């Protein structure tokens, strides 16, 4: 796959490199994220990563974990993004494949994410990995248009 054939290095997110994630998020997403987002992303440990290409931080995947009463793990992908000059060369796939590999180590894992309903490019990207649109939430986002999201998910 495309993620297996790009020279990328992944690093975990910690307090010492948190500013890199904050800059990426400021550029990539119109949603403003607060301290709870950053605490959740760090607490997801191996599921949250920064991506480095040509020794520059160019993307990230940030997750939030929840343990269900069944004992199964639910993984939320909170954010996934790659800086525009470095898109289309496998970095997003590398980040997502890393999370999918971490999920395969937890039995009966399920993964959920939210995507704006007009983000046709991202929807196509996720469908390649086996994700499906399973729901729509009206008025999910406050200030952007459209305000609706798809809930996109994959079960293991």
């Amino acid at each position: 796959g495309a993620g297996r054939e790009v020279s990328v290095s992944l690093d975990g997110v910690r307090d010492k490199n948190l500013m890199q994630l904050k800059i990426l998020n400021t550029v990539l997403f119109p949603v403003r994220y607060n301290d709870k987002y950053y605490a959740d992303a760090i607490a997801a440990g191996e599921f949250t990563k920064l991506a480095y290409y040509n020794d520059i931080c160019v993307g990230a995947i940030a997750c939030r974990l929840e343990k269900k009463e069944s004992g199964a793990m639910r993984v939320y992908i909170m954010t996934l993004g790659v800086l525009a000059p470095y898109r289309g060369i496998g970095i997003g796939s590398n980040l997502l494949n890393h999370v999918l590999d971490m999920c395969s180590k937890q039995n009966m894992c399920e993964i959920y994410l939210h995507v704006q309903t007009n983000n046709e490019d991202a929807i196509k990207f996720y469908k390649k990995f086996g994700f499906e649109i399973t729901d729509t939430i009206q008025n999910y986002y406050i200030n952007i248009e459209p305000r609706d999201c798809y809930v996109v998910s994959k079960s293991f």
Binding site: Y33, Y37, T79, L113, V115, I142
Partner: peptide
């Protein structure tokens, strides 16, 4: 892209 939280 999760909403603000």
């Amino acid at each position: 892209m999760v909403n603000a939280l």
